[PDB]
Subunit: 73 residues, 8 copies
């Protein structure tokens, strides 16, 4: 559970990019092909970046859902 | 204002925020309650901003789906 | 009521600066001395920038207050 | 981590967000409910981020109050 | 007075770049050779950008000097 | 943590601010009141941040001077 | 709205992206599929954005070449 | 593989600058004279930054080429 330190590590714009990429996978099934990265340590780093977006997507949906300005349809 | 001009007007930060909000709606059903905005001119402006993110989400999805670095499930 | 167009005009960081300046005035009484600006059109432009921060402060407090993650003490 | 190091770690964007949240608390009473965070490690990280904004709000207030371009009421 | 509108058009980072270029000219004499640009459209745009930085340098100096956190040495 | 990483640690925004502050000092004499900082660790960190700007100002001056688009006046 | 304002209209992030895309085209031949855009107004706007990057690439090339810190190899 | 960590350390704008510098070298031959830096600390930092841009140029080319939105001409 380092996800918050990684928000500051990646920065706002790259954190938002990863969160968008996760949102794309969730509704369309379009997913980065992590198994086509040759080097293992790079695959681990890429997966860390993408997995942060997945976590951030879940945290962001929960936060917006906590506001009376949003509703679940 | 066309969608591309809106991207440049909002800037990358706020464009990504709106795109992420759209992704949350598509997967979560959690939707901004546009109707609860009382002023009709503010309602219109907020709708333009959110609708930009819906467009950008779909354009981004199509672009990633256009690349062999993404798989499709 | 152009305040939203001005968010995009000023940009994220300068919009946040103005909102912070308004928050400072609200709790400390420390306020920019607008009447010491010689030229009238500049005073009008500076007041527009500061007044946007005052509006944005009010909109932001209302939004956070709409979330169950915040409470009024 | 000292407050200045936190500024550089968070970056200007997120530092201003936290400073604005602190300003909202001081004037509105609207306060982030830190206690509702269940994980103790996440609670600590969020508290560090919000407490940075409280510090930055007071440092900013003092700096503006140090200038003849600001009046005091 | 187009300088304040130029700040918002340029944004913070490009505004600071121009102000640093002005500072470099003031202390070293190293100056951009605008007279070598013969496309007058390009020349006028470059002149407006550089002249903004010269104005911003003078306003920034005055503001910092207005603060007890700075001293004229 | 060395000096040579500080551009990326401070980030572009705050590195430009420090460089701007240095340029202001060089031709106006307006200088940050380091003597008013009474925690020696904070003073050291502030001195590092300001001196990075002084160094960056000197390097940027030399780089612009190395270009035939600039002339010493 | 002229060409010479587009740096500030697109902003630094997206101007750098366009410039990067142009550099990729110049040495790899990999080129954006303008022919796949079938709204003529959108095609024109995309062509303007891409050609700004081509122009900026040529200007930046010439500027770096004007410096004694760069050599033609 | 330090290049991905370098992206996050440098941030998007400085990462794109380095990638454009690499693109300029590839198409024009205009190359930074790293051999003129004799402070080996500074030299190594500059080399790491420029070498990142060279790697990023190759990865960015490959990614764009992987898309049906680009064609090799
Ligand atoms: C706009 C993008 C968000 C920008 C924030 C990011 C940085 C902030 C920059 C400084 C502060 C920004 C101030 C701008 C706030 C916009 C206010 C607004 O446009 O909405 C006003 C609307 C009025 O409602 P009305 O019925 O007329 O009430 C009258 C009495 N006020 O009342 C409301 O609508 C209240 C709720 C605001 C809804 C506007 C857009 C909301 C959709 C995006 C929410 C995303 C939250 C961020 C989380 C990111 C997670 C990915
Ligand atoms: C892992 C490797 C990663 C390396 C990548 C980085 C390499 C550096 C260069 C990458 C640049 C990406 C390619 C940019 C080419 C510009 C293409 C373009 O302008 O878009 C054309 C497209 C028109 O498509 P059309 O369907 O006809 O229009 C629909 C209705 N308007 O219009 C569109 O579809 C616009 C879609 C924009 C949605 C984005 C909103 C969020 C902002 C993201 C910021 C970064 C994205 C850059 C967008 C370029 C702007 C044009
Ligand atoms: C951190 C700064 C905000 C960054 C957003 C700006 C750009 C977003 C970048 C991409 C998306 C960012 C994703 C990061 C979200 C952080 C999530 C987090 O740290 O909080 C997790 C916390 C866990 O709670 P727990 O009891 O453990 O629940 C277990 C099941 N999840 O659950 C929660 O705490 C839920 C509420 C989140 C509280 C974290 C900080 C909130 C205080 C700032 C709110 C400001 C909202 C922005 C409005 C600006 C107006 C000025
Ligand atoms: C209208 C005209 C406007 C023109 C202005 C623009 C001109 C360009 C240059 C302006 C730069 C402003 C002055 C920068 C000088 C650096 C001084 C510094 O580093 O701060 C010293 C201060 C130490 O004070 P002390 O009380 O001893 O510490 C308390 C416990 N730590 O530590 C502090 O107090 C730090 C306070 C930081 C709080 C800011 C958080 C939000 C981020 C804002 C981004 C811009 C602010 C730049 C901050 C400089 C970073 C050091
Ligand atoms: C210039 C880029 C330097 C950095 C390159 C690094 C690679 C990545 C950078 C890409 C980012 C996009 C940059 C936009 C380029 C602007 C083009 C320009 O203004 O060129 C004007 C001038 C034209 O000279 P010309 O008359 O055509 O040549 C005579 C030959 N017969 O030719 C010139 O050289 C005049 C330039 C004046 C600017 C001086 C400021 C020095 C540092 C500026 C950095 C930011 C640029 C902001 C310029 C805004 C100008 C409106
Ligand atoms: C924090 C102070 C709030 C006052 C409002 C000022 C507008 C926000 C400025 C924040 C600038 C941060 C970026 C720094 C880049 C350089 C910009 C700059 O130097 O602007 C300062 C200048 C002052 O403007 P002004 O006083 O109205 O001029 C007429 C005076 N008789 O313009
Ligand atoms: C350099 C700034 C140019 C723009 C100036 C515009 C004014 C505002 C800019 C201020 C922003 C802060 C910039 C940080 C400055 C970095 C200093 C540096 O790296 O200089 C290294 C090199 C030293 O050369 P040296 O051996 O000391 O001279 C021999 C004399 N006996 O001397 C050098 O010149 C090497 C520089 C290599 C970078 C080439 C890239 C060209 C465009 C870079 C723009 C962004 C800079 C990123 C550099 C990161 C390097 C780690
Ligand atoms: C949108 C794709 C999501 C995939 C994750 C990629 C990380 C986010 C990258 C967004 C970059 C935007 C800024 C562009 C500046 C240049 C950065 C760049 O060129 O990075 C691309 C590169 C690909 O990395 P990678 O594929 O892991 O390398 C090993 C391959 N065997 O690294």
């Amino acid at each position: 559970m380092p996800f918050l330190s990684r928000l500051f590590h990646y920065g706002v714009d790259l954190a938002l990019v990863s969160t968008c990429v996760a949102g794309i996978r969730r509704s369309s099934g379009i997913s980065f092909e992590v198994e086509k990265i040759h080097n293992e340590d790079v695959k681990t780093a890429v997966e860390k970046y993408l997995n942060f977006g997945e976590w951030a997507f879940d945290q962001s949906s929960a936060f917006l859902g906590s506001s009376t300005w949003f509703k679940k349809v």
